[PDB]
Amino acid sequence: ITIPKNWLDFGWDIMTLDARQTMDNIETIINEFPEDFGTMLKSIDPRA
Amino acid sequence: ITIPKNWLDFGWDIMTLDARQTMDNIETIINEFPEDFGTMLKSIDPRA
Amino acid sequence: ITIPKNWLDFGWDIMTLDARQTMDNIETIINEFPEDFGTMLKSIDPRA
């Protein structure tokens, strides 16, 4: 109990860390809507 | 072994939690770049 | 065992509350890009 608590629970908060290493990418993908397409709205502005 | 159960438990709340809290700081920090370089792409477009 | 569970486990998620002050600030900085640099696209626009 005591030793796995200190290091494997840490390891399974690290199982949980997969969120807090992928939300970087997901938020970049959020930001890709204004970056890759919010740009393109400012291209629809030229078209208009 | 209860002395370990005392000190190691709130102790591991550095290990478990910091691996996540430092990384989300990093995820959000990195998400500045989809807005820094974001605004650079969003400037190249309206130049047209 | 119970004293950490009452004060220090709580306390070390409170050490984990440090990111839950930084995270706002960093996200405001993520926002300072589409705020300042994002309004300054509309400097690059009339300059164009």
TrEMBL record, chains A, B, C:
This is Phate tail tape measure protein. It comes from Haloferax tailed virus 1 (HFTV1). The chain holds residues 148 to 195 of 341 of the full protein.
